[PDB]
UniProtKB/Swiss-Prot annotation, chain B:
Keywords: Acetylation, Carbohydrate metabolism, Cell cycle, Cell division, Cytoplasm, Glycogen metabolism, Host-virus interaction, Hydrolase, Manganese, Metal-binding, Nucleus, Phosphoprotein, Protein phosphatase
Catalytic activity: O-phospho-L-seryl-[protein] + H2O = L-seryl-[protein] + phosphate; O-phospho-L-threonyl-[protein] + H2O = L-threonyl-[protein] + phosphate
UniProt PTM comment: Phosphorylated.
Gene Ontology terms describing biological process: branching morphogenesis of an epithelial tube; cell division; circadian regulation of gene expression; dephosphorylation; entrainment of circadian clock by photoperiod; glycogen metabolic process; lung development; negative regulation of transcription elongation by RNA polymerase II
Sequence positions bearing Phosphoserine: 16
Main location: cytoplasm
Protein name: Serine/threonine-protein phosphatase PP1-alpha catalytic subunit
Induction description: Up-regulated in synovial fluid mononuclear cells and peripheral blood mononuclear cells from patients with rheumatoid arthritis.
Binding residue positions for Mn(2+) 1: 58, 60, 86
Taxonomic lineage from the root: Eukaryota, Metazoa, Chordata, Craniata, Vertebrata
Impact after mutating residue 178 to A: Promotes SMP complex formation
Role this protein plays: Protein phosphatase that associates with over 200 regulatory proteins to form highly specific holoenzymes which dephosphorylate hundreds of biological targets. Protein phosphatase 1 (PP1) is essential for cell division, transcription elongation, and participates in the regulation of glycogen metabolism, muscle contractility and protein synthesis. Involved in regulation of ionic conductances and long-term synaptic plasticity. May play an important role in dephosphorylating substrates such as the postsynaptic density-associated Ca(2+)/calmodulin dependent protein kinase II.
């Protein structure tokens, strides 16, 4: 979820 | 370049409260980048490695976890190491992480190996944290120096003709290992093609053949692509990283592919361990695991 480039 | 002084300062913080920085000089880090880049260019882009060795997946600037991995597995050169990429971004200490890895590459260039991950790419690390860390703690010129070094990292490795290692995974354009060997360096990571896929693709349990990748680039691939690849090239295992896995490691396609992820506690969603894979002299694989906090 950190941003799906990737949690 | 006083490598032992650099390594000594990087290791000094073992046992400190996780978070303590090691601030090398700008000239020292430039030297690490320039010398390691020379070494990367002097060695093949497709490495041919021998077991035994330890294989590590993504680190993402989790420097104290890197130190734990070395504590568990043996500090170089007590064990040979292959890292699969994604050294920087996301974590708090990308600088210490990459500096220690580059220092060990220079000190032990035939016993310590670093592959390129998709985060070893200016387009990605501009946004995902490494540029900001360089700008805050050093300057942007040093970030470019890092980029120039990353552009020379090797892309894949084959251990004892049996384990194919890369950061991401397979490519629909990968028909011969010679295609990898023909890739010229320095290079950026393209947004499509063989080099892109090797750093970006993912295995998927629900894909037959090649599918669209949720990342917006490259592809997903299924279990039969893996089996066909291993059969064609007389390989036993694909070892890759790139995806967070709860156990630190995860097998795929009836244990024909393994994903390693070495940064524990990476995400807010689920807890994840970090794992390092020990490959013994006969290519038998076991794991050393940083369990989640
Ligand atoms: Cl498939
Ligand atoms: Mn990755
Ligand atoms: Mn990663």
């Amino acid at each position: 979820x950190l941003x799906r480039x990737x949690x | 370049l006083n490598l032992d002084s650099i390594i000594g300062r990087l290791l000094e913080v073992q046992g400190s409260r996780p978070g303590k920085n090691v601030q090398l000089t700008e000239n020292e880090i430039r030297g690490l980048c320039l010398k390691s880049r020379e070494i990367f260019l002097s060695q093949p882009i497709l490495l041919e490695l021998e077991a035994p060795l330890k294989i590590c997946g993504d680190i993402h600037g989790q420097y104290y976890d890197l130190l734990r991995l070395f504590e568990y597995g043996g500090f170089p050169p007590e064990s040979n190491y292959l890292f699969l990429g994604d050294y920087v971004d996301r974590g708090k200490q990308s600088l210490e992480t990459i500096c220690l890895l580059l220092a060990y590459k220079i000190k032990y260039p035939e016993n310590f190996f670093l592959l390129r991950g998709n985060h070893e790419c200016a387009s990605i690390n501009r946004i995902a944290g490494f540029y900001d860390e360089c700008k805050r703690r050093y300057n942007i010129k040093l970030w470019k120096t890092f980029t120039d070094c990353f552009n020379c990292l090797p892309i894949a490795a084959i251990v004892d003709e049996k384990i194919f290692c890369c950061h991401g995974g397979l490519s629909p354009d990968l028909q011969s290992m010679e295609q990898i060997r023909r890739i010229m360096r320095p290079t950026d990571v393209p947004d499509q093609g063989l080099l892109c896929d090797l750093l970006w693709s993912d295995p998927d349990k629900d894909v037959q053949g090649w599918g669209e990748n949720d990342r917006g680039v490259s592809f997903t691939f299924g279990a039969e692509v893996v089996a066909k690849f291993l059969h064609k090239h007389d390989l036993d295992l694909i070892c890759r990283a790139h995806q967070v896995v709860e156990d630190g490691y995860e097998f795929f396609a009836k244990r024909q592919l393994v994903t390693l992820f070495s940064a524990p506690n990476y995400c807010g969603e689920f807890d994840n361990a970090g794992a390092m894979m020990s490959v013994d002299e006969t290519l038998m694989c076991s794991f050393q695991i940083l369990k989640p906090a």
